[PDB]
Structures are given as structure tokens and as C-alpha cells.
Amino acid sequence: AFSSEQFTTKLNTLEDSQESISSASKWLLLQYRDAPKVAEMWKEYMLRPSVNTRRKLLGLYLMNHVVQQAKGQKIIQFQDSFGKVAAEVLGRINQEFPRDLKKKLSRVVNILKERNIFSKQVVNDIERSLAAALEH
Amino acid sequence: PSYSPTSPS
């Protein structure tokens, strides 16, 4: 019935190619039922010290994809679930990722607030967390 | 191939 590590396995079979991310994103977008489940799993995975920066950045791309495409699907369930964990994950990666990677996530999170992907309540928390880490 | 937010698919 339920495939074990169905989400985890896909995260380890992705590439930095849009054709790859889209293949997993479109697969997740059809199963919005597990929105809160994949959201916490994503969060937990990126919080694991066993996950190298390569995998962290890869998983981050999948999040941007599903939350952005969710606008067309009109499924706020994804944005809601991923939004509450995004503020945490973004705050963590922004304090561990190098200069070259922080810049990449900057444009990723920028488009999220520019396109009003998440609620203003959490959006204001994400942007402030990024600035807080810059307070030394 | 490089992934950018403006080019997801």
C-alpha cells in the first residue's frame, strides 16, 4: 500500500536538472494528501547531519518547485505545510551554506515572497530570520 | 544542467 521511504528515495535520485526536479515535483503535486507528511519529512531530512550540502541544495529545489507550481493547482495545502517548515529550514541552511550557496537560495526565497507564495505571516518570519543571521 | 526558480520544468 504505502511505499516505504517513497519521498526519501526520490530525493536521492534527483539531479540539478529542471527535467529531474520537475519529474519528482509533478509526482508529489498529484498526491497533495501527504502534503504535511512530505513537509515534515523534507524538514527532517534537511536537518539531518548525514545529508551533505549537495543533497540539501537538491532538496531545496524540489520545495521551490512544488510551492511555485501549487499556485496553478490552487492547493494551498502544500504551501501551508511547506511554509511553516520553510522558515525553519531556510534559517538553518542560511547559517551553514557558504557565500556561493547563500546567494543561490537568496533568489529562490526572493521569488517566493515576490510571487506571494506563502502567507505574509510566515513570509515576514523567513525574511527576518535571514536578516537575523546577518546580525553576527 | 543548473536549476533556476524561473526555469523549474
Instruction: Return the SS3 of A52.
Output: coil
Chain B residues within an 8 Å CB radius of A68 = 5, 8
Q: CB A18 to CB B6 under 8 A?
A: no
Cβ density class A102-122: b for 16+ within 10 Å, e for less:
bebbeebbebbeeeebbeeeb
User: At how many degrees (to 10) do helices A120-132 and A99-114 cross?
Assistant: 160
Distances (CA, A) of A84 to A17, A29, A105: 26, 18, 17
Tell me if B1 sits within 8 A of A19, measured CB to CB.
yes
Q: CB B3 to CB A16 under 8 A?
A: yes
Query: Cβ neighbours of residue A64 under 8 Å, at least 6 residues apart?
Result: A108, A111, A112, B5, B8
Tell me if A90 sits within 8 A of A130, measured CB to CB.
yes
In chain A, where the domains are located: 1-136
> How many Å apart are CA A115 and CA A119, to the nearest integer?
11
Chain A with chain B: Cβ pairs closer than 8 A: 35
Instruction: Return the SS3 of A91.
Output: helix
DSSP H or E segment with residue A90: helix A76-93
C-alpha cell at A110: 526572493
CATH architecture assignment, domain A1-136: Alpha Horseshoe (1.25)
